[PDB]
Design a protein around this ligand. Structure first.
Ligand code: NA
Length: 105
């Protein structure tokens, strides 16, 4: 359910999306990232039609990571209309994530 996005297609997939986009910045070495991965996948299902959910591997896409100030992972960015409207740093429980996301729908 969760599209993997890279430096190459970030602009098209995230910035030019027709709906808000939740972007999960992660890497294989990150323990907490692996913890939230299934949460993100399940949230993609719940928000089908309302929010697009994508993941970006920061090891493979350091440029996008640097451009958006991703100084630590996990970090979730919520984009709307091509701009960051929320930044969620560190692991957070499903309900806290939903309330933050809901606020922007
Ligand atoms: Na973090």
């Amino acid at each position: 359910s969760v599209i993997e996005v890279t430096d190459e297609n970030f602009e098209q997939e995230v910035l030019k999306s027709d709906k808000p986009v939740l972007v999960d910045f992660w890497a294989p070495w990150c323990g907490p990232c692996r913890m939230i991965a299934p949460i993100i996948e399940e949230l993609a299902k719940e928000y089908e039609g309302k929010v697009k959910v994508v993941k970006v591997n920061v090891d493979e896409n350091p440029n996008t990571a640097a451009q958006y100030g991703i100084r630590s992972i996990p970090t979730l960015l919520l984009f709307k209309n091509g701009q960051v409207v929320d930044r969620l740093v560190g692991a957070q429980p499903k309900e806290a994530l939903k309330e933050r996301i809901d606020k922007h729908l």
